[PDB]
């Protein structure tokens, strides 16, 4: 539970600075054509918020990328590519730490058992003789 807690924090930080990168990436070379929302790195948060809000308003910018930077198909695929690669693993990573706990515990539960049945079998003999 608390073990995996730190794991996501560093990953989200990777993701945070993955943002800082893609913000530094996007802003510079996507502005001057449609520079209302591509001046500041803030636009990447917007871009997040955009994606959170299922933008389809960069569809506009995508029409503008078809007019201005068709490469942006990549630099839209990029935001999509970067997000999934990030968010899944941070989740999977935790799925794993979630799935990793119980298997030990299952064996942990079975751990105490075999010895008990043995610790049982041992004193079980001590009556038919003593």
């Amino acid at each position, epitope marked *: 539970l608390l073990r995996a807690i730190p794991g996501i924090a560093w990953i989200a930080l990777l993701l945070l600075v993955i943002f800082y990168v893609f913000a530094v990436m996007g802003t510079k070379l996507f502005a001057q054509s449609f520079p209302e929302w591509f001046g500041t790195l803030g636009a990447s948060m917007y871009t997040l918020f955009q994606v959170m809000t299922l933008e389809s308003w960069s569809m506009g*910018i995508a*029409r503008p990328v078809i007019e201005a930077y068709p490469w942006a198909w990549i630099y839209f695929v990029s935001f999509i590519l970067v997000s999934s690669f990030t968010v899944l693993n941070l989740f999977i990573g935790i799925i794993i730490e979630s799935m990793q706990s119980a298997h030990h515990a299952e064996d942990g539960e079975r751990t105490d058992a075999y010895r008990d049945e043995v610790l049982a079998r041992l004193e079980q003999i001590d009556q038919r003789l003593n």
Partner: antibody, heavy 122, light 111 residues
């Protein structure tokens, strides 16, 4: 709230009239105002849009440059100079705020301006 | 980008109390941020439906708008005194190149 719609009238071609829009019961400075003309027996035509906090030079292809819309925050006042009329643009024009600011809708027409009838042919 | 809010039908004559649906077709991927408004003749715009569902503060419940991707449709079931009306959509970008409002739907009262 109240929208100030004035500066209409009849004129001849090549003429340039400045359609004034002053802010009343709303901070335009954060808001954004758009202009759209209703031809007789026709619907709206989203002309332009703007301080929009940031200075959004936003205007439709129909009057692309032929008109230039702006505003004075200091007076809570806006303007729309439709130059170069053509008479094609002869239609009753009303300016309003679909503002993405603090005081208006953001979703659409927060209100409607009184509208002043412009007849550009003599 | 480009937008062409094709509203239908042309002539819409109906009796009072009846249920009426004003439909509009989107050219490209128009989002949830759809707007429709109705105004009496020589009367100011009245924003009807905000975000394609939200009635403006004071807007009666008598009318409502639905979304079906490309198809966006407004509907009213009970004729209000404002029976005779018009209907045009409005397609928005949060802040982007394309701006468009509807080609208009004449809502006539059939006598």
């Amino acid at each position: 709230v109240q929208l100030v719609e004035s500066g209409g009238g009849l004129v001849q071609p090549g003429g340039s009239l400045r359609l004034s829009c002053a802010a009343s019961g709303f901070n335009l400075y954060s808001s954004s105002i758009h202009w759209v003309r209703q031809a007789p027996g026709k619907g709206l035509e989203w002309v332009a849009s703007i301080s929009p906090s940031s200075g959004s030079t936003y205007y439709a292809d129909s009057v692309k440059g032929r008109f230039t819309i702006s505003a004075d925050t200091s007076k809570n006042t806006a303007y729309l100079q439709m130059n170069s009329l053509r008479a094609e643009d002869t239609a009753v024009y009303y300016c309003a705020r679909t503002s993405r600011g603090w005081i208006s809708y953001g979703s659409g027409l927060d209100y409607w301006g009184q509208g002043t009838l412009v007849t550009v042919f003599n | 980008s480009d937008i062409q809010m094709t509203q239908s039908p042309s002539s819409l004559s109906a009796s009072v109390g009846d249920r009426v649906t004003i439909t509009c077709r989107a050219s490209q991927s128009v989002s949830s941020a759809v707007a429709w408004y109705q105004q009496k003749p020589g009367k100011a715009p009245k924003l009807l439906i905000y975000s394609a569902s939200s009635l403006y503060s004071g807007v009666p419940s008598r009318f409502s708008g639905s979304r079906s991707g490309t198809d966006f449709t407004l509907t009213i079931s009970s004729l209000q005194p404002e029976d005779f009306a018009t209907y045009y959509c409005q397609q928005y970008i949060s802040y982007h190149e394309p701006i468009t409002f509807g080609q208009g739907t004449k809502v006539e009262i059939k006598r």
